[PDB]
């Protein structure tokens, strides 16, 4: 039995670095709509579907939709891989 690594097997570490950084890039934009506030809100975005509280379109809410689509895709591909 592998320790830790076995869970990490389906998707490459570099890809993880990518999804993280890309998540950061998503994270700033919500604050661009407004150094930690809406960054923390983005932390409240990945946690649940994607984004909130935006008063109709505004700006980065569409980023929330794209992000939702995004994480949806990746988790799907992940699960398929483990399968």
């Amino acid at each position: 039995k592998p320790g830790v690594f076995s869970f990490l097997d389906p998707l490459a570490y570099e890809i993880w670095m990518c999804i993280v950084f890309a998540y950061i890039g998503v994270s700033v934009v919500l604050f661009l709509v407004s150094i930690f506030n809406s960054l923390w809100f983005s932390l409240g975005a990945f946690m649940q579907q994607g984004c909130d509280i935006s008063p109709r379109s505004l700006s980065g809410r569409i980023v929330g939709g794209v992000w939702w689509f995004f994480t949806l895709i990746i988790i799907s591909s992940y699960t398929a891989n483990l399968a």
Partner: protein, 179 residues
Amino acid sequence: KTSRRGRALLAVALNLLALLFATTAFLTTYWCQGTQRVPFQLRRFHTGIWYSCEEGEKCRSFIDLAPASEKGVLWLSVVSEVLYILLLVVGFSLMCLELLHSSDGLKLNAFAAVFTVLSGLLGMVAHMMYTQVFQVTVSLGPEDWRPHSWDYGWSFCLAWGSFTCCMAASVTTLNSYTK
């Protein structure tokens, strides 16, 4: 007022370091380590981003491999690097204009911050494109050199650091903007 100024200069500083890392990516000493020892056959590759060194010592200017489409992918890659550098420099320029006002304003810093964002995004896309070309080259079996390692070149990590630093400067100058 010392707070916003010190955080701002800290921001242009982080941007500057980030520029040094961008140059570092543009000046990698050798992109990844490599070896081929299957005797006779014994080798120690040290491929550059452009100058593929090997080790007696033997630096080599390969550059622009991976036939179909991938050359154009390198085109978009390098162009994205250039625009990356341009948005960096525009960031320094606008922030130095803020320094001229330190010697709109906030709207202008928001602009430069947006340029930092576009720079970081296009840059991450660029590094993606390059890793794509690299993995493709290895996938084609690069002429002879197909190293069992090639695991990573730290300068690239430094490029990612330049990214997170630009991110860090944009958000904090905007934190000053929040005030």
